[PDB]
Design an enzyme around this catalytic site. Structure first.
Site, PDB file in Angstrom:
ATOM      1  N   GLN B  11       0.822  -1.205   0.000  1.00  0.00           N
ATOM      2  CA  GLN B  11       0.000   0.000   0.000  1.00  0.00           C
ATOM      3  C   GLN B  11       0.859   1.259   0.000  1.00  0.00           C
ATOM      4  O   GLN B  11       0.605   2.200  -0.762  1.00  0.00           O
ATOM      5  CB  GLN B  11      -0.946   0.003   1.200  1.00  0.00           C
ATOM      6  CG  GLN B  11      -1.769   1.284   1.295  1.00  0.00           C
ATOM      7  CD  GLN B  11      -2.704   1.304   2.483  1.00  0.00           C
ATOM      8  OE1 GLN B  11      -2.688   2.240   3.280  1.00  0.00           O
ATOM      9  NE2 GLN B  11      -3.533   0.273   2.604  1.00  0.00           N
ATOM     10  N   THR B 179      -1.818   1.504  12.939  1.00  0.00           N
ATOM     11  CA  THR B 179      -2.636   0.722  13.853  1.00  0.00           C
ATOM     12  C   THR B 179      -2.035  -0.652  14.127  1.00  0.00           C
ATOM     13  O   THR B 179      -2.668  -1.472  14.799  1.00  0.00           O
ATOM     14  CB  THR B 179      -4.059   0.583  13.304  1.00  0.00           C
ATOM     15  OG1 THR B 179      -4.009   0.191  11.926  1.00  0.00           O
ATOM     16  CG2 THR B 179      -4.795   1.906  13.413  1.00  0.00           C
ATOM     17  N   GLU B 183       5.246  -4.157  13.518  1.00  0.00           N
ATOM     18  CA  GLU B 183       6.108  -3.572  12.498  1.00  0.00           C
ATOM     19  C   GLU B 183       7.597  -3.631  12.838  1.00  0.00           C
ATOM     20  O   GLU B 183       8.402  -3.767  11.898  1.00  0.00           O
ATOM     21  CB  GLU B 183       5.665  -2.130  12.229  1.00  0.00           C
ATOM     22  CG  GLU B 183       4.365  -2.042  11.456  1.00  0.00           C
ATOM     23  CD  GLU B 183       3.905  -0.616  11.252  1.00  0.00           C
ATOM     24  OE1 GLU B 183       3.375  -0.026  12.215  1.00  0.00           O
ATOM     25  OE2 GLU B 183       4.082  -0.084  10.134  1.00  0.00           O
ATOM     26  N   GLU B 254      26.064   6.289  -9.777  1.00  0.00           N
ATOM     27  CA  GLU B 254      26.656   7.466  -9.153  1.00  0.00           C
ATOM     28  C   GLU B 254      26.126   7.698  -7.745  1.00  0.00           C
ATOM     29  O   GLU B 254      26.798   8.352  -6.941  1.00  0.00           O
ATOM     30  CB  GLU B 254      26.415   8.693 -10.035  1.00  0.00           C
ATOM     31  CG  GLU B 254      27.371   9.844  -9.779  1.00  0.00           C
ATOM     32  CD  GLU B 254      27.488  10.782 -10.969  1.00  0.00           C
ATOM     33  OE1 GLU B 254      26.989  10.422 -12.059  1.00  0.00           O
ATOM     34  OE2 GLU B 254      28.079  11.875 -10.814  1.00  0.00           O
TER      35      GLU B 254
HETATM   36  N1  GTP Z   1       3.926   7.553   4.087  1.00  0.00           N
HETATM   37  C1  GTP Z   1       3.000   6.618   3.892  1.00  0.00           C
HETATM   38  N2  GTP Z   1       2.975   5.517   4.716  1.00  0.00           N
HETATM   39  C2  GTP Z   1       2.050   4.552   4.537  1.00  0.00           C
HETATM   40  C3  GTP Z   1       1.109   4.652   3.524  1.00  0.00           C
HETATM   41  N3  GTP Z   1       0.320   3.555   3.588  1.00  0.00           N
HETATM   42  C4  GTP Z   1       0.745   2.774   4.608  1.00  0.00           C
HETATM   43  N4  GTP Z   1       1.810   3.386   5.211  1.00  0.00           N
HETATM   44  C5  GTP Z   1       2.602   2.888   6.347  1.00  0.00           C
HETATM   45  O1  GTP Z   1       2.970   1.553   6.066  1.00  0.00           O
HETATM   46  C6  GTP Z   1       2.856   0.743   7.220  1.00  0.00           C
HETATM   47  C7  GTP Z   1       1.837  -0.367   6.982  1.00  0.00           C
HETATM   48  O2  GTP Z   1       2.251  -1.164   5.898  1.00  0.00           O
HETATM   49  P1  GTP Z   1       1.457  -1.191   4.498  1.00  0.00           P
HETATM   50  O3  GTP Z   1       2.278  -0.611   3.371  1.00  0.00           O
HETATM   51  O4  GTP Z   1       0.148  -0.457   4.633  1.00  0.00           O
HETATM   52  O5  GTP Z   1       1.178  -2.773   4.310  1.00  0.00           O
HETATM   53  P2  GTP Z   1       1.447  -3.576   2.938  1.00  0.00           P
HETATM   54  O6  GTP Z   1       2.826  -3.307   2.389  1.00  0.00           O
HETATM   55  O7  GTP Z   1       0.392  -3.208   1.922  1.00  0.00           O
HETATM   56  O8  GTP Z   1       1.376  -5.132   3.354  1.00  0.00           O
HETATM   57  P3  GTP Z   1       0.060  -5.883   3.920  1.00  0.00           P
HETATM   58  O9  GTP Z   1       0.267  -6.247   5.373  1.00  0.00           O
HETATM   59  O10 GTP Z   1      -0.117  -7.145   3.121  1.00  0.00           O
HETATM   60  O11 GTP Z   1      -1.143  -4.987   3.759  1.00  0.00           O
HETATM   61  C8  GTP Z   1       2.404   1.642   8.349  1.00  0.00           C
HETATM   62  O12 GTP Z   1       3.555   2.018   9.064  1.00  0.00           O
HETATM   63  C9  GTP Z   1       1.795   2.829   7.632  1.00  0.00           C
HETATM   64  O13 GTP Z   1       1.896   4.007   8.393  1.00  0.00           O
HETATM   65  C10 GTP Z   1       1.123   5.759   2.684  1.00  0.00           C
HETATM   66  O14 GTP Z   1       0.291   5.860   1.780  1.00  0.00           O
HETATM   67  N5  GTP Z   1       2.074   6.742   2.875  1.00  0.00           N
HETATM   68  O1  GX4 Z   2     -10.825  -8.162  15.606  1.00  0.00           O
HETATM   69  C1  GX4 Z   2     -11.523  -7.186  15.309  1.00  0.00           C
HETATM   70  C2  GX4 Z   2     -12.647  -7.313  14.316  1.00  0.00           C
HETATM   71  C3  GX4 Z   2     -13.450  -8.584  14.319  1.00  0.00           C
HETATM   72  C4  GX4 Z   2     -14.055  -7.316  14.843  1.00  0.00           C
HETATM   73  N1  GX4 Z   2     -11.279  -5.951  15.893  1.00  0.00           N
HETATM   74  C5  GX4 Z   2     -10.190  -5.777  16.874  1.00  0.00           C
HETATM   75  C6  GX4 Z   2      -9.249  -4.683  16.367  1.00  0.00           C
HETATM   76  N2  GX4 Z   2      -9.974  -3.410  16.151  1.00  0.00           N
HETATM   77  C7  GX4 Z   2      -9.194  -2.226  16.010  1.00  0.00           C
HETATM   78  C8  GX4 Z   2      -9.710  -0.994  16.458  1.00  0.00           C
HETATM   79  C9  GX4 Z   2      -8.960   0.175  16.334  1.00  0.00           C
HETATM   80  C10 GX4 Z   2      -7.691   0.109  15.764  1.00  0.00           C
HETATM   81  F1  GX4 Z   2      -6.964   1.230  15.642  1.00  0.00           F
HETATM   82  C11 GX4 Z   2      -7.157  -1.097  15.314  1.00  0.00           C
HETATM   83  C12 GX4 Z   2      -7.904  -2.264  15.436  1.00  0.00           C
HETATM   84  C13 GX4 Z   2     -11.259  -3.474  15.393  1.00  0.00           C
HETATM   85  C14 GX4 Z   2     -12.087  -4.760  15.568  1.00  0.00           C
HETATM   86 MG    MG Z   3      -1.865  -3.812   2.234  1.00  0.00          MG
END
Ligand code: GTP
Ligand code: GX4
Ligand code: MG
Ligand code: ACP
Ligand code: GDP
Ligand code: CA
Ligand code: CA
Ligand code: CA
Ligand code: MG
Ligand code: MG
Lengths: 54, 438, 352, 425
Positions: B11, B179, B183, B254
């Site tokens: 993402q 969230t 990480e 470079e």
């Molecule tokens: N700067 C920036 N950070 C991002 C963005 N999207 C996600 N992040 C950061 O990336 C981390 C989460 O990893 P993601 O890139 O969302 O996950 P992923 O690479 O898609 O891998 P999955 O677990 O399969 O979803 C978190 O620390 C987020 O704050 C973005 O659009 N811009």
């Molecule tokens: O397991 C579940 C879903 C089945 C209901 N949840 C636990 C994690 N929840 C969460 C909330 C805020 C947040 F920032 C991150 C995670 C949302 C709901």
């Molecule tokens: Mg993703």
């Protein structure tokens, strides 16, 4: 404070300033890692199914 | 002319990649439909911008990019966004379920089953290049795809393209915009397996971008759109030399030559300025000395750390706008007599400087105001080790209890890979200390 | 409700500061490893500065300036003075000093001997003192051979500096002494000098014809209380406070502690701290620093003040712990984390 | 297209499951006949997560109603939104389970379980990409407890790599139907320890005290208690049913909430909980102080008796997301003595613009707290009080069970307590 290698073109220029002088894993080996982890997943799922069969 | 292929994984990489190519198009005068009026050579040419764009017989300028995500929601924004016409479907690759923030899942479970498809799509872009330089790889540390699948792709690119350079743009995990909790695990796992495969990596700490957005742009709670538009400016400042006429950082090699004298220590610190809010009534335009002086303020660094307590190994000054060498040297002199700039004894105390007369382009309606001149400093400091220390400490806290480890073992990873990757980071931290401290 | 952590159980000072913080009912002490803290009473060695200021929403403050060691290391201070244009090599208030590495390991051995030979030939007093930070290990001698050989027997860096052969002697007693000034530097880099000092006096008559017995030359509170037989004779604990010392200067020398000594001290504290301000300031940093320093001065018979060393984790005089510790909580901690006079400090204004 | 299959079993499971589909059907603008009638596209953005799309733009919940007696599901079919459920998805017998875990798990339930799995398989076979399953049930009876845990065992066997979450009502002697509830609860808990990724522990006593003490309901009913569960279920699934900050699926959510496979029992909470002074606007500080207050939690466990492994909170409505972070980072940094310090940043917050029906804003609490061991200690104590005398065992041995299986369930629960205890120190 010397300026060396000054290059100028139509869209900009670049140079270098000196303030002071100084004083892999093969394709096969990757396939093994990938398949070894796949084999550990298969083994773990087998123990789960063996558990559920019991 | 030599081509560069950009790879956006996860993402973070896909959305950042989307922001950059939007910016590239505005800078090179390319419209959303791929047409470029100023390109007088129709369907061909070896211009500087051709390093990043190919051309069709119909005059379309197509990015040399591949987008990869294990889940399709982010890449579906590209397929339907403003610049949907730039890419063709072969360039956008999406799975159906992501890696759940699990490195082992993106590297092993899911990565194993899609790695060959991605290599095939990349091979197609490579087959359009007469002299491929290498790859720019965008991804996050925290994501299960950005971390786990990127390290697998890097291993395979090292095999399939041995003599090609690979640069990274990596997003360092920040709790204020995450969230997740695992990480630190993914970051350390992906750095261990990617280290030997990456020639030069630019770490962007989300915490740094977050504060710059609140502080300089007066955004109370910045979004990813805010962060990405600021991040794509820094990325443009770093890749501009490859896309424009010039003589500094004219090819991917470079970057290692100028910023990485030691291979493992390949994480240059990035500092950018000025970042002026567009909503401002009207800002006083800063001088070359002021924006250059800002490059030594931690507040505008891509990774919050104190370079006053490190040693520099290299330093690059990339200017855009109304800047002439005279003013640069004049500012540099003043800063040396006021700032703490300690180089290593086996490296010259100097600065490589690049100036591109075209001022920074800003996306219409964005948050950044149009300035007459701006600069990006690339400096390889041992102070950036603070980020490895922070991240490694969080890893130790959870790994002492084996917290969340069952999620990785469950996908086929061995516990030993954890400690193996951690001991590599310990060796990395010791390398920085031997180079910076006395 | 503010939160703080204690990571140096041996600090008598901040043990009292922590004891006071809890007394306000508005500060909560957390475990020494809980990162969700507002204030870190950090350790002396290897304080993890890189981990400060990375907690979302928490303004974090630490009681040590990263890099102040440049000023609190015997060998570092000498290098800072000689190489800093703000202090220059001709600095008039710091004794001639040289960095000397043991031969079993830049080094200023030859530079020292050049100045030493000059003094010996000019009939001038040629007595030096060798010391190091790894001491409780000091040697005073008039022969360059003894000084250098003493260092080679050790294995750590040392400093050889000129010995003040004309110290100001208190009467009655004819005894040496030094002056301790506590200085607090807050997050804004205001330099506050505690209005209360202490003279660590020697209870033995100064003897310039015998540097072998170091009980009359070294005014350390531990040496006097261990190797001195007149400890506590003239003043309690060999500690004379500014009130008495000032009264003495008026009766004996017909001058005041302010005019004769304090002006030079205030000037020295400023010059030292202003020098390193660009290197250690936390003005634009993601965390905030403050620190308490202990300056040690020497006074000669001409009433010229000489800087001895600077301490980074000093202790306080028993009679002044309460007033000073409370002063740290007022200007250093509560200034950043306010609660729900006639200051005990002297703000040394300066240009930032 | 990340679909979820919903299963509700037994009396409690179906009456709570029914109110759940009543609540979210209103939030997505689905009327009792399955026709959409909303005014925002956000209502349909993630509509396929819980609803199937039939001909004529009809939306049919992806739910399977299971019971060993027809009564309760006859109520659902004749209830408010009864017509919205797929007729084939009603699977029920006539024997009943007599509040006997052995009947639901081994005899009566075994005779019916295969036909339930046939419906589950039918719903799964249509999912573009199955996220996982969610089960609503009580642990104190026979069907939702005994046969529910049997369904989970057979679902995991056929879908081993899919997430399994449950909303489990825990018995209490204060809100009790039969004296054998501790037996049934202890037997189910071990099934959940092994076979669920997440279990939201809903204690009937906590629900009762909230209705009596906070809501000022003189004589609470099961209906009243279920109003709290519906609202809590709508809260935890908000991040799944609407677009917002986090777009995570069940697996990613579980990855960050569950540091250890067996310690996956959550304490849910909800705010506000106001008595009829019901129109007053609730500020962010109030929403946060209540959300973390024990009186707003449905596990009947004092969090100040244990430590949070992880904490999640979802804020709904148009509010100051800046002031949200300020109040959250205030509750943590003011009570960090109850959060484990060896999981950095274990308190996460997310926002959703759409508030529940008739509320300017609300917050749902989700805590993985070691204090949940107090709930399992209660159950274990009541279990051993009877089992030491073999009281009421004949109801279970008459169904083919042996005393040894009871002794094992006892040890398993007491091990579970011992596992929570080590992580609290
Ligand atoms: N700067 C920036 N950070 C991002 C963005 N999207 C996600 N992040 C950061 O990336 C981390 C989460 O990893 P993601 O890139 O969302 O996950 P992923 O690479 O898609 O891998 P999955 O677990 O399969 O979803 C978190 O620390 C987020 O704050 C973005 O659009 N811009
Ligand atoms: O397991 C579940 C879903 C089945 C209901 N949840 C636990 C994690 N929840 C969460 C909330 C805020 C947040 F920032 C991150 C995670 C949302 C709901
Ligand atoms: Mg993703
Ligand atoms: N150049 C010099 N001339 C005269 N006396 C000196 C001197 N250097 C040190 N001394 C004596 O040594 C004593 C302090 O020594 P020094 O401060 O170097 O050791 P130290 O740092 O372990 C003691 P502290 O840190 O507590 O001040 C003083 O009392 C002073 O009289
Ligand atoms: N909250 C709530 N609890 C219930 C409801 N019905 C039964 N219970 C509880 O669940 C247990 C009885 O289980 P029950 O669902 O009737 O058994 P089953 O029909 O065989 O699955 C007892 O502990 C009851 O207190 C209900 O509608 N709401
Ligand atoms: Ca062309
Ligand atoms: Ca390589
Ligand atoms: Ca039968
Ligand atoms: Mg000392
Ligand atoms: Mg019943």
């Amino acid at each position: 404070m010397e300026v060396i290698e000054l290059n100028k073109c139509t869209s900009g220029q670049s140079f270098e300033v000196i303030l002071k002088p100084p004083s892999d894993p093969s394709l096969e080996e990757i396939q093994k890692k990938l398949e070894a982890a796949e084999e550990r997943r298969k083994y773990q799922e087998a123990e789960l199914l063996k558990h559920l069969a019991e | 002319m030599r081509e560069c292929i950009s790879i956006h994984v996860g993402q973070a990489g896909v959305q950042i990649g989307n922001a950059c190519w939007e910016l590239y198009c505005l800078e090179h005068g390319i419209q959303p439909d791929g047409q470029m009026p100023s390109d007088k050579t129709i369907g061909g040419g070896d211009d500087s911008f051709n390093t990043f764009f190919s051309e069709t017989g119909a005059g379309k300028h197509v990015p040399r990019a591949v987008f990869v995500d294990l889940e399709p929601t982010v890449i579906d924004e590209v397929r339907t966004g403003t610049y949907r016409q730039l890419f063709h479907p072969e360039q956008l690759i999406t799975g159906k379920e992501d890696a759940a923030n699990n490195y082992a899942r993106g590297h092993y479970t899911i990565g194993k089953e899609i790695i060959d498809l991605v290599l095939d799509r990349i091979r197609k872009l490579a087959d359009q290049c007469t002299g491929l330089q290498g790859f720019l790889v965008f991804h996050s540390f925290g994501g299960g795809t950005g971390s786990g699948f990127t390290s697998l792709l890097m291993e395979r690119l090292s095999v399939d393209y041995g003599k090609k350079s690979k640069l990274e743009f990596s997003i360092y995990p920040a709790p204020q915009v995450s969230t997740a909790v695992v990480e630190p695990y993914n970051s350390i796992l992906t750095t261990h397996t990617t280290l030997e495969h990456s020639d030069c990596a630019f770490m962007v700490d989300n915490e740094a971008i977050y504060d710059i957005c609140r502080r300089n742009l007066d955004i109370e709670r910045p979004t990813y759109t805010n962060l990405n538009r600021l991040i794509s400016q820094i990325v443009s400042s770093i890749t501009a030399s490859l896309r424009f006429d010039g003589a500094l950082n004219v090819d991917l090699t470079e970057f290692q030559t100028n910023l990485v004298p030691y291979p493992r220590i390949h994480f240059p610190l990035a500092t950018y300025a000025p970042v002026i809010s567009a909503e401002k009534a009207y800002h006083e335009q800063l001088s070359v000395a002021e924006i250059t002086n800002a490059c030594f303020e931690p507040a505008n660094q891509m990774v919050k750390c104190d370079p006053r307590h490190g040693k520099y190994m290299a330093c690059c000054l990339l200017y855009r706008g109304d800047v002439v060498p005279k003013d640069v040297n004049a500012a540099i002199a003043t800063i040396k007599t006021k700032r703490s700039i300690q180089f290593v004894d086996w490296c010259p105390t100097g600065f490589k400087v690049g100036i591109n007369y075209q001022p920074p382009t800003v996306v219409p309606g964005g948050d950044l105001a149009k300035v007459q001149r701006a600069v990006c400093m690339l400096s390889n400091t041992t102070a950036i080790a603070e980020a490895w220390a922070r991240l490694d400490h969080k890893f130790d806290l959870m790994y002492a209890k084996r917290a969340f480890v069952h999620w990785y073992v469950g996908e086929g990873m061995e516990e030993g890979e954890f400690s193996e990757a951690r001991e590599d980071m310990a060796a990395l931290e010791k390398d920085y200390e031997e180079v910076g401290v006395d | 409700m503010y939160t703080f952590v204690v990571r140096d159980e041996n600090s008598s000072v901040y043990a009292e500061v922590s004891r006071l913080l809890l007394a306000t009912g508005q500060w909560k002490r957390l475990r020494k490893d809980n990162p969700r803290f507002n204030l870190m009473l950090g350790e002396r060695n290897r304080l993890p500065f890189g981990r400060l200021g990375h907690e979302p929403g928490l303004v974090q403050l630490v009681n040590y300036y990263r890099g102040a060691d440049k000023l609190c290391r015997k060998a570092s201070l000498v290098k800072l003075i000689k190489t800093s244009p703000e202090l220059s090599e001709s600095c008039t208030w710091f004794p001639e000093s040289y960095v000397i590495y043991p031969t079993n390991l830049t080094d200023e051995r030859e530079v020292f001997l050049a100045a030493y030979n000059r003094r010996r030939e000019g009939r001038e007093g040629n007595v030096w003192i060798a010391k190091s930070s790894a001491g409780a290990g000091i040697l005073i001698s008039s022969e360059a051979s003894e000084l250098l050989d003493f260092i080679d027997e050790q294995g750590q860096v040392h400093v050889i500096q000129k010995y003040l052969e004309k110290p100001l002697l208190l009467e009655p007693g004819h005894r040496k002494f030094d002056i301790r000034s506590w200085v607090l530097v807050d997050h804004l880099y205001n330099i506050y000098l505690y209005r209360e000092g202490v003279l660590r006096t020697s209870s033995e008559p100064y003897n310039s014809a015998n540097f072998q017995d170091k009980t009359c030359h070294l005014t350390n509170h531990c040496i006097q209380k261990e190797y001195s037989k007149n400890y506590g004779r003239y003043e309690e604990g060999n500690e004379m406070f500014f009130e008495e010392f000032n009264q003495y200067l008026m009766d004996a020398l017909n001058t005041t502690l302010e005019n004769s000594i304090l002006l030079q001290i205030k000037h020295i504290i400023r010059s030292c701290l202003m020098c390193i301000e660009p290197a250690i300031s936390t003005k634009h940093l993601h965390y905030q620093s403050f620190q308490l320093f202990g300056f040690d001065f020497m006074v000669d018979e001409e009433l010229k003040v000489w800087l001895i060393e600077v301490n980074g984790a000093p202790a306080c005089a028993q009679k002044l712990y309460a007033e000073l510790c409370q002063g740290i909580v007022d200007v250093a901690i509560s200034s950043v984390f306010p609660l729900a006079p006639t200051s005990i400090f002297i703000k040394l204004h300066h240009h930032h | 297209m990340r679909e979820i299959v919903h299963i509700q079993a037994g009396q409690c499971g179906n009456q709570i499951g029914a109110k759940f589909w009543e609540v979210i059907s209103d939030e997505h603008g689905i009327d009792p006949t399955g026709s959409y009638h909303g005014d925002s596209d956000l209502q349909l953005e993630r509509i396929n997560v819980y609803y199937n799309e039939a001909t004529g733009n009809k939306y049919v919940p992806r739910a399977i109603l299971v019971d060993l007696e027809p009564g309760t599901m006859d109520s659902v079919r004749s209830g408010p939104f009864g017509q919205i459920f797929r007729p084939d998805n009603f699977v029920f017998g006539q024997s009943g389970a007599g509040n006997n875990w052995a009947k639901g798990h081994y005899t009566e339930g075994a005779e019916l379980v295969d036909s339930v799995l046939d419906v589950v398989r039918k719903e799964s076979e249509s999912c573009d990409c199955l996220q996982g399953f969610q089960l609503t049930h009580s642990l104190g009876g026979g069907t939702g407890s005994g046969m529910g845990t049997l369904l989970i065992s057979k679902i995991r066997e056929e879908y081993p790599d899919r997430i399994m979450n449950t909303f489990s009502v825990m018995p209490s002697p204060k809100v009790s139907d039969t004296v054998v509830e501790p037996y049934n609860a202890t037997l189910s808990v071990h099934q959940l320890v092994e076979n669920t990724d997440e279990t939201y522990c809903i204690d009937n006593e906590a629900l009762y005290d909230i209705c009596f003490r906070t809501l000022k309901l003189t004589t609470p009913t099961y209906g009243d208690l279920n109003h709290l569960v519906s609202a809590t279920m709508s809260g935890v699934t908000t991040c799944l049913r609407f677009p917002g900050q986090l777009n995570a699926d069940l697996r990613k959510l579980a990855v960050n909430m569950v540091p250890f496979p067996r310690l996956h029992f959550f304490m849910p909470g909800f705010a506000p909980l106001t008595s009829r002074q019901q129109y007053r606007a609730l500020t962010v500080p109030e929403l946060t102080q209540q959300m973390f207050d024990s009186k707003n939690m449905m596990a009947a466990c004092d969090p100040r008796h244990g430590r949070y492994l992880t904490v999640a909170a979802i804020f709904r409505g148009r509010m100051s997301m800046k002031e949200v972070d300020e109040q959250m980072l205030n509750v943590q940094n003011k009570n960090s003595s109850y959060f484990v310090e060896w999981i950095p940043n274990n308190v996460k917050t997310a926002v959703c613009d759409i508030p529940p029906r008739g509320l300017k804003m609300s917050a749902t609490f989700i805590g993985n707290s070691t204090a949940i061991q107090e709930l399992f200690k209660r159950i274990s104590e009541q279990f051993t009080a009877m089992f030491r005398r073999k009281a009421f065992l004949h109801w279970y041995t008459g169904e083919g069970m042996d005393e040894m299986e009871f002794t094992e369930a006892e040890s398993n629960m007491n091990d579970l307590v011992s596992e929570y205890q080590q992580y609290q120190d």
